[PDB]
Design a protein around this ligand. Structure first.
Ligand SMILES: Nc1ccc(-c2cccc(C(=O)O)c2)cc1
Length: 242
């Protein structure tokens, strides 16, 4: 079942922004959101696409393991952390587009299209350039669709090996302490309106898992920190985390 809690709208408006948070209680099989309509509106996945892209690259052998070094191509880019060697873990962490563009070129259109359909991922449409379609092509995914996809990943139910799924979930590790573990991926879509930020993943507790997917308007890069901050305020409000 699904519940709309418009009280969460405060967390967005108080920061002069608009967006949606979608939560899914795995034990109770219940979903919650501030905005049922936007929860089902499809956006460019941008760097959240690094989750499916990593899975496909690993399963096809494009990426051997999480230690394989992807050498910087020597082209200076405006993101300092991109101008260095990466492995899967650091490429995820710093959302290093050029590494994942190379993955996609090696995957190829045919295998990428087939795998996204097998994942039931978004609109499954890779129209555009194979090395940028998640940034300015035809692929779209909603917040509820991100949840559906992440739940399959959590349970190792995607049509790739258990190993590929374990490795990607390792690479998704974002935060861990004595109270919870967050595995997630940020996204930042600027090439097509509306510009949005994403944060999708889940929170692991001792006896339950809460999946989450949020997006919010992002007119400038100055509000990027609000993706995680707003999500955590909701989690705190719902007493999912202290
Ligand atoms: N102008 C600009 C600012 C920041 C970025 C950037 C880099 C790396 C990661 C992320 C993110 O998804 O949080 C965003 C990219 C362009």
């Amino acid at each position: 079942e699904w519940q709309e809690n418009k009280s969460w709208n405060a967390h967005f408006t108080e920061h002069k922004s608009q967006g949606v948070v979608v939560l899914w209680n795995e034990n109770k099989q219940q979903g919650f959101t501030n905005n049922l309509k936007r929860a089902n509106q499809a956006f460019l996945p941008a760097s959240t696409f690094k989750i499916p892209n990593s899975l496909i690259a690993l399963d096809l052998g494009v990426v051997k393991d999480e230690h394989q070094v992807f050498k910087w191509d020597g082209q200076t880019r405006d993101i300092a952390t991109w101008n260095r060697d990466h492995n899967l873990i650091t490429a995820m962490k710093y959302s290093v587009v050029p590494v994942y563009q190379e993955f996609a070129r090696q995957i190829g259109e045919a295998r990428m299209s087939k795998m996204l359909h097998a994942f039931d991922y978004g609109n499954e449409d890779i129209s555009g350039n194979v090395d940028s379609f998640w940034l300015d092509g035809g692929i779209r995914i909603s917040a509820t669709e991100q949840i559906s996809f992440l739940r399959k990943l959590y349970h190792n139910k995607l049509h790739v090996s258990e190993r590929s799924q374990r490795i990607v979930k390792q690479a998704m590790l974002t935060e861990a302490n004595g109270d919870y573990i967050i595995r997630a991926k940020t996204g930042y879509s600027t090439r097509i309106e509306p510009k949005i930020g994403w944060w999708v993943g889940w929170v692991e507790l001792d006896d339950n898992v809460w999946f989450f997917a949020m997006n919010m308007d992002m007119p400038t890069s100055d509000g990027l920190g609000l993706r995680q901050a707003i999500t955590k305020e909701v989690l705190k409000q719902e007493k999912i985390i202290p």
